Symmetry: C3
Subunit: 335 residues, 3 copies
Amino acid sequence: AEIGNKVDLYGKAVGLHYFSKGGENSYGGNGDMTYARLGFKGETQINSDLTGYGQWEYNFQGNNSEGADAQTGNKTRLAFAGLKYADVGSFDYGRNYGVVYDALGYTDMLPEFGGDTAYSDDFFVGRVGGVATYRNSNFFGLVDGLNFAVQYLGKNERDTARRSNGDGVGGSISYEYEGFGIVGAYGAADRTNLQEAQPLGNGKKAEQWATGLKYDANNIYLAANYGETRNATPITNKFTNTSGFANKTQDVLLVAQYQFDFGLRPSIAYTKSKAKDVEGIGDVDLVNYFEVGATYYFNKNMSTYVDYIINQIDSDNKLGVGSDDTVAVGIVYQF
Amino acid sequence: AEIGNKVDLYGKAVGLHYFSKGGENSYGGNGDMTYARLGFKGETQINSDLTGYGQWEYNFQGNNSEGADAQTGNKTRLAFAGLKYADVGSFDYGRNYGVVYDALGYTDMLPEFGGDTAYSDDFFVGRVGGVATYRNSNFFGLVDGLNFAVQYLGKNERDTARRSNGDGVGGSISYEYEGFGIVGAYGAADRTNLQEAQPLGNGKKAEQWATGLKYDANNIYLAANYGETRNATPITNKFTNTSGFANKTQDVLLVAQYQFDFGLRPSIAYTKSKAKDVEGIGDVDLVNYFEVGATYYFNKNMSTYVDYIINQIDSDNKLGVGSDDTVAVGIVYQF
Amino acid sequence: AEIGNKVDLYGKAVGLHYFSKGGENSYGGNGDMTYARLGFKGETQINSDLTGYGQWEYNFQGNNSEGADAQTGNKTRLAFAGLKYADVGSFDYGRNYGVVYDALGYTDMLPEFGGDTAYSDDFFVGRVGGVATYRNSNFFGLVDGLNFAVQYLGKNERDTARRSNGDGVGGSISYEYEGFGIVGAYGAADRTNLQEAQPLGNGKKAEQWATGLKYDANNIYLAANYGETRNATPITNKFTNTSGFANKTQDVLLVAQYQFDFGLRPSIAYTKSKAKDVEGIGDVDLVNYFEVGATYYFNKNMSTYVDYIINQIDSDNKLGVGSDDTVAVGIVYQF
Ligand SMILES: [Br-]
Ligand SMILES: [Br-]
Ligand SMILES: [Br-]
Ligand SMILES: [Br-]
Ligand SMILES: [Br-]
Ligand SMILES: [Br-]
Ligand SMILES: [Br-]
Ligand SMILES: [Br-]
Ligand SMILES: [Br-]
Ligand SMILES: [Br-]
Ligand SMILES: [Br-]
Ligand SMILES: [Br-]
Ligand SMILES: [Br-]
Ligand SMILES: [Br-]
Ligand SMILES: [Br-]
Ligand SMILES: [Br-]
Ligand SMILES: [Br-]
Ligand SMILES: [Br-]
Ligand SMILES: [Mg+2]
């Protein structure tokens, strides 16, 4: 809620419970999942052709005690600033969305779950540190609906292989016309020595790509993503306590939703990602499910939701991917 | 300070020092105790019979360095959202006050100390994770001053016995009339296997109950709480480095205060909690003291206070409960 | 941005990258250095002679992942409240700037680097916990431009020698007249037993002092600081993994800047600190460099900057102080 400069502090409180049998063997786990969010975003008009802007956003976990676990799962999601010039484009630097999320964003619309391939700190698919992003709308004002973006990922040598990266570039192009949108996005980067010493994944570069199609009009939302990755998607073998990256993955995400005037937004979805050439096992499913779910919007400040994952991962999955379903029920106050 | 929706960011900065001899052997300890608070609370009118709301609140410690200890004692206090409907009642889910605090709230009014039995993450007496709370004012609008509440506590299997719980229900009823208020509150819950493996406490359920009486009118505040607990109150034997829960406790809390027009709010108080059937020792006092103290309110944004604990715990207490007095002097800017 | 009481929430997002060769052997290091800041400051008019106030401020790192490193470098910078009375003076308690920073503040003006001797949690030179500060402007209203301050530092017995202190007093006096300012500041304090068990530094008290001269007018800023310290400045011998405090240091800081109407603020600077009588090595340089740099201010909400450290520390420095240069390029949205 808005606190020549327009600055806006924002957030929400999310009362959130997950239901699974036992949740060690499930898609989402079991129990209290309450958290809150806080951030600001602002933009300042510098002149008629130039705006300056910034955004910061934080996750506060609501399901930890006030003892020594208090900080578990607290983190900054976003922290960047930039400049937007005339028809030239925008440029920002900091922690932000990786460019391949320009595609994955199409399916990442579910009430609680979904977007399973947009890992955080995973090269270009999710939120990530140290990125320089250039974005361009309507091709310099010459072509209504043709947007593009390029992004430069600086190396992050962290203590974990999962959270690290090397230098890389990625980019994306999209075209929209009367409710239809089409997008493609691709990136590659160096892997770090720590990533390469892992027993899962083989190679010295990582690539992610995805294409998107979507129809967004007349209270209907339909969307589709297909993508693949090389040496990029993080993976654990829970049976030998083995970690790393899948050599290859192949990914599909489908979503159908409708918006009723009275607030009810039903959701239907399917998601599958399968890893290939995983050392010592071959091909495995990482994600496999159908979704049903709904959100009820009381207004712009208040909603509740149920999200139900009909898990299709079989009880024998070779890496130890859980097989039970998960339901989520949430209540949200936002501003 | 207020930032169809009414949302309010709030907080305070508390300059705070504690004085004790040595503070290893004291009630409150010795030294810098500065901290700050930040939160939001908002409510949105959905229609004439329905409001939606949320609250989040965080504790930032001000007495840690900017080195590796920086986060010590930082935590979310509250994070919940809910719906309030007509005369039906309110319902919220998230981290919130346990229902037995509906009684303990009567005495928890001192400038710095007091409220010694309202432990955090301790079933129903204090702030706790994963609770669903229903509250009812004036009995559905049929009975002015008769309020009640029921609360459902979801199991929290944490890494510590102190911070965990099992599933449980608790509730409370109160009646108020012309400055007088009367309250009763009770809850029980399952204890977790971790709690049961402790060497202090014996049993597979936990119960807390308390009654409250108070007079709140004509610039006078008088209040009284009596309560008991089974297998609920956390306790340490500092002499053998032994921890767990007291089998039984018996608790009394008394408070007298007056408000002068010029801002001066003197406080007088007494508090005693005694554990029974503590393994290998029998009966012990956990808390035993008189208080004198005062707050000076400059206005609604600024106050100072002194709070002085006249400790009655004797120097031989069998669990190693400290015996020296503690003074606290604070200065508070809030908004 | 301002959210009888005037309260102001504020912050910035800083997109920030450091360039060094390799940065293990450099002044500033290499890579992503993005972070954000959030705080409030408020003041309340209690009557015509009395204002009450508070300030809190936090550092959120933007260059950590959302995994287990998420909190690295997050901390409260400031958290205090106080009262300002008529001509008498102001008094505040909490975490705040140490009084010797009243001098070091003169040179601490560079776009990214500079202020190298104003260590955090280091007695009086930097931000520190548990201080009571009295400040006086115009000598009780009797002497325009003559300010003074005294400060009382409470002992902080922490787990690290670097972050601890004993009880101490420090103070400062300054005089300003038509763009010229002159300042002196001094403090001493007890060292704690932990500090004394270190292999670097010898003695049972710590003192810091500094003098400042500055010209601040006509879009010119020139300033100069000289100071010394005994048993106060923290130091590591990276060759034997040895830590502690330099017995003596001698410090010089120089800065020249100009402000163009169009926003461009060029900076020129020199900084040297040298430790003496360091056990097992004698005299060593801790800091030695020239700076060139600039900030471009688009407006009051947006700026970019480059800051370039021309390191003069030689490749043989005896404690292992790095010798390569560092450049920093930043983009800042603030409110
Ligand atoms: Br917490
Ligand atoms: Br995500
Ligand atoms: Br993830
Ligand atoms: Br990051
Ligand atoms: Br654009
Ligand atoms: Br649907
Ligand atoms: Br801290
Ligand atoms: Br409490
Ligand atoms: Br507690
Ligand atoms: Br909790
Ligand atoms: Br009610
Ligand atoms: Br009284
Ligand atoms: Br983080
Ligand atoms: Br500093
Ligand atoms: Br430092
Ligand atoms: Br501190
Ligand atoms: Br003054
Ligand atoms: Br210059
Ligand atoms: Mg934090």
